[PDB]
Amino acid sequence: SNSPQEEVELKKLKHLEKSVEKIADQLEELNKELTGIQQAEALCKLDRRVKATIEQFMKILEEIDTLILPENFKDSRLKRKGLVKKVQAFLAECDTVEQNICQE
Amino acid sequence: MSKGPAVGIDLGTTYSCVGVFQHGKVEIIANDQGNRTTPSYVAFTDTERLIGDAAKNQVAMNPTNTVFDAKRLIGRRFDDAVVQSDMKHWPFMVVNDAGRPKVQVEYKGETKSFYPEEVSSMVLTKMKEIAEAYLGKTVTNAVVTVPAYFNDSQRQATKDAGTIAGLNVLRIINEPTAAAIAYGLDKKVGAERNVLIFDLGGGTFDVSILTIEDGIFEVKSTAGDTHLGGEDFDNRMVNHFIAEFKRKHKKDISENKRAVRRLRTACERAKRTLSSSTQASIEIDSLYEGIDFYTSITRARFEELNADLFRGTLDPVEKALRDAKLDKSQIHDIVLVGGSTRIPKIQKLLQDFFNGKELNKSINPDEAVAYGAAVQAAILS
Ligand SMILES: Cc1ccc2c(N)ncnc2c1
Numbered sequence: 001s002n003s004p005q006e007e008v009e010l011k012k013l014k015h016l017e018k019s020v021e022k023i024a025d026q027l028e029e030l031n032k033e034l035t036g037i038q039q040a041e042a043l044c045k046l047d048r049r050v051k052a053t054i055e056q057f058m059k060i061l062e063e064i065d066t067l068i069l070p071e072n073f074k075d076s077r078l079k080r081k082g083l084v085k086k087v088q089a090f091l092a093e094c095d096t097v098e099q100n101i102c103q104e
Numbered sequence: 105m106s107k108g109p110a111v112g113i114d115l116g117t118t119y120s121c122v123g124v125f126q127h128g129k130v131e132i133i134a135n136d137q138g139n140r141t142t143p144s145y146v147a148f149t150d151t152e153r154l155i156g157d158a159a160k161n162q163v164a165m166n167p168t169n170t171v172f173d174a175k176r177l178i179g180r181r182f183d184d185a186v187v188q189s190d191m192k193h194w195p196f197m198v199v200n201d202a203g204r205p206k207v208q209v210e211y212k213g214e215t216k217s218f219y220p221e222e223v224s225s226m227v228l229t230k231m232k233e234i235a236e237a238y239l240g241k242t243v244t245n246a247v248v249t250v251p252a253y254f255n256d257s258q259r260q261a262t263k264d265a266g267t268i269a270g271l272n273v274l275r276i277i278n279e280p281t282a283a284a285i286a287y288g289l290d291k292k293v294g295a296e297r298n299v300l301i302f303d304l305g306g307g308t309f310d311v312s313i314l315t316i317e318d319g320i321f322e323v324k325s326t327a328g329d330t331h332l333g334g335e336d337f338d339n340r341m342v343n344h345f346i347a348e349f350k351r352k353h354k355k356d357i358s359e360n361k362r363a364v365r366r367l368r369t370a371c372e373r374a375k376r377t378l379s380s381s382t383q384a385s386i387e388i389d390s391l392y393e394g395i396d397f398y399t400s401i402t403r404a405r406f407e408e409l410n411a412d413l414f415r416g417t418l419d420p421v422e423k424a425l426r427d428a429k430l431d432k433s434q435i436h437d438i439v440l441v442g443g444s445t446r447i448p449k450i451q452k453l454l455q456d457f458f459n460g461k462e463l464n465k466s467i468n469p470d471e472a473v474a475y476g477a478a479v480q481a482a483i484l485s
Contacts, residue, residue, distance in 0.1 A: 048150065051165040058164070058362065062369045065388050081396075084389040091362070 001072075009069060009076040016060060017083055020090075023056045027090060034097055043101035050097045057087050057094065108241030110274055110485045112282075112477025113231050113248050115224065115262070116306045117175045120144050120156075121471060122231040123478035124239065130286075130478045132471045133238045141470055142234065145172045146226045148211035155230040167195040169209045173307075174227070177205050177220035178265070179258030186330070221261045225268035232271060245272045247481040249473050252278040252312050252323045274484040279303070280312035281321045282476030283439045287464045290319050297436040298324075300424070302454060304417060305442020305469065307333040311420040313428040313435075324428035327420040332413065334375070334444045340409040341371040341401065348399060349392070357392040366391060378403045379446045407449045414449050418457055438463045441472045 030049055037043060064084060069077050112130075114121040119141040123132045132140045137157045147159035147170040154162065163170045176190050182200040191198040197208040199217060206217040228248070235243045248271075250262050259276055266273035280301040284290060289299055296317040303310040309332040313325045345367055346358050357363040366388055374384035382403045391397035407414070425432060438454065440463055445451070455463060467475050 048165070052162075055162070055164050058365065061366055065366060065370050065386075066373060068385050068387050081389050088390060 002075075003072070006073045006076055009067065009073060010079065012067065013076060013079045013083065016064060017079075020057075020060060020083065020087060023053060023060070024090060026056075027053050027093060030097060031093070034100065038100075043103075046097065047102050050094055050101065054091065054094045054098070057091055060087055105236070105240065105242045108236070108239050108243045110245035110247070110481035111231075111235045111243055112474050112479070112481045113228065113246050114279070114282075114471075114474035114477055115175070115228065115231075115248055115250075115265075116144060116473075117173055117308055118144055118306045119470070120227055120231055121474035122235050123471070123474040124235060125478050125482035130475045132468070132474060133235055135234045136237070140468075142227075142230060143172070144174065144227050145170060146174075146223050147171070148209045148216070150212060153211070153226070155226055169196070169211070171196055171207050171209065171218070171223050174207075174220045174223040177207070178224055179220070179254065179261035180205065221265045222268060224262065224265035228265055228269035228271060232269060244270070245274050245481065245485065247275050247277055247282075247477045247484065248273055249277055249279045249282050249477050251308075251310060251326075252280050252314075253310075253326045274481060277477065277480060278312075278321070278323065279310075279441070279473045280314055280323070280439075282473045282480065283441050284314065284316065284321065284437075285476035285479050286467050286472055287437070287439060289437055289439075290316050290321070298428075298430055298434050299437045299439065300421065300435050301439045301441060302417075302421070302445060302463075303328070303441040304444040304450060305333065307331070307335065309333065309417065309420065311424045313424050313430065315428075324430070325424040327424040327427070329416075329420065332417075334372075336413055337375060337406075337410050337444070337447075338368060338371050340413075341375060341406065342368055344401075344405070344409055345371065345386075345399065349395075349397065353395055355393055355395070360392055363392040367397075374401050375406065378406050379448065403448070410449075414447075414453060417450060418453060421454075421457065432458055435461070439472075440465045440469055443470045445469050 030046060030053060034046060064080060109124055112123045121132060121141050123130050134140050135142050142156040143160040145156060145159035147154040147162055147166060149166060159170060177187060180187050182203055182205045187205055199206050199208050206219055207223060208217050232243050248262060248266050250259055263273055263276055283301050284299055289297060296315050299314050301312040308330055309328040311327040315322050315324055349355060349357055370386045370388060374386060377384040383400055385400045388397040435458060438458060438461060446469060451463060455461065
């Protein structure tokens with residue numbers, strides 16, 4: 001049974017999804033420049049950026065964690081898990097970039 | 105910009121605060137981010153210098169070149185025991201420069217060193233700027249606070265920071281004294297008053313006993329733990345949760361920095377909630393290995409997890425009474441300062457020790473020292 005209260009939560013999650021789309025675009029640019037190099041000094045310039053992207057994603061997860069959702073709010077709960085799974089996948093992409101750059 | 109009033113600045117270990125006296129009331133000024141407190145953090149990046157929230161928010165990205173806890177270094181010699189012990193825990197380099205400590209960072213590609221009072225000036229600069237943005241007038245005159253135990257060297261090095269920041273330091277006042285001003289302890293009719301200031305917050309624990317006669321404040325004794333604070337309470341919640349995950353799922357999340365952080369951030373929100381609620385709920389989706397973490401914490405359990413730490417805050421009070429040569433019955437007023445005094449159990453323990461004596465807590469415990477400092481700034485205007 002769809003409640004007006006759930007709309008408030010869904011809108012919070014829609015903003016977070018939009019923030020993730022913004023950070024994801026930065027990562028796509030980062031991936032493209034890393035692919036570009038792979039075609040040393042350039043790699044530690046990407047270090048500063050991948051570390052910032054990681055942090056932006058970590059701050060999103062921290063914000064998502066502040067939400068407590070009633071089991072009744074099924075659509076919101078599904079949107080939350082989706083977004084967390086989506087962010088975590090991006091964090092694994094981050095870690096790939098980080099482990100490739102600044103290598104001795 | 106027109107000439108503005110005098111402000112009160114609480115320069116603290118982990119956070120700073122600024123207040124002004126206008127329209128017969130003290131207003132604690134909020135910063136650019138809307139926060140009433142600003143972290144005592146200064147970061148040096150490849151492109152710029154960040155102070156406060158901007159510096160703290162990027163500590164994870166640049167741990168080595170982000171400076172904090174300058175108050176632990178200011179006015180001290182390099183060979184000082186506190187400096188040697190403390191530096192074993194900072195992500196930044198502390199170097200010896202002719203017997204004096206200096207912090208070594210990488211600012212705009214170059215290796216640079218700053219004295220603790222230079223780093224403090226950068227924080228005081230941000231407080232002045234926070235006050236100017238609010239008033240729309242230029243601020244110079246200010247009252248800056250220092251802990252009652254700071255020696256001659258530590259007191260002057262702070263005055264020096266005010267000068268480097270471009271401030272006219274009207275007076276240097278003890279934090280405990282500024283806490284008594286805020287609650288108008290000095291203006292109280294009668295004889296000499298024995299006052300105990302209980303300070304638990306900003307990563308330090310400070311007990312102070314002062315006696316005030318004829319508008320005179322005298323430090324009769326200082327005690328406490330220089331490394332006890334809110335973060336210690338947090339670890340106990342994190343361990344409790346890590347062990348709960350081990351019980352319920354047989355997986356160790358301790359070795360995963362991101363899992364632990366998500367959990368830590370959630371424990372800080374829970375501890376805060378437990379100051380006003382008897383239970384706090386935590387819902388973390390996919391915490392570690394795809395497992396969701398839905399748990400809850402009681403105020404009772406939180407209290408049990410920190411029982412030794414909480415009780416231990418009374419040993420310092422006992423130590424200070426013995427040094428001031430006072431009985432607990434001789435204490436006229438009890439003042440609570442710092443955020444961690446918001447904890448109901450700490451309040452209960454302290455009130456019981458003082459046989460039901462009511463505690464002074466009306467003024468925000470984070471804003472208390474800065475409130476008084478702003479009252480004193482108005483008086484010296
Ligand atoms: C509301 C609130 C704020 C801050 C704190 C704090 N710093 N320590 C413990 N409890 C708190 C509660």
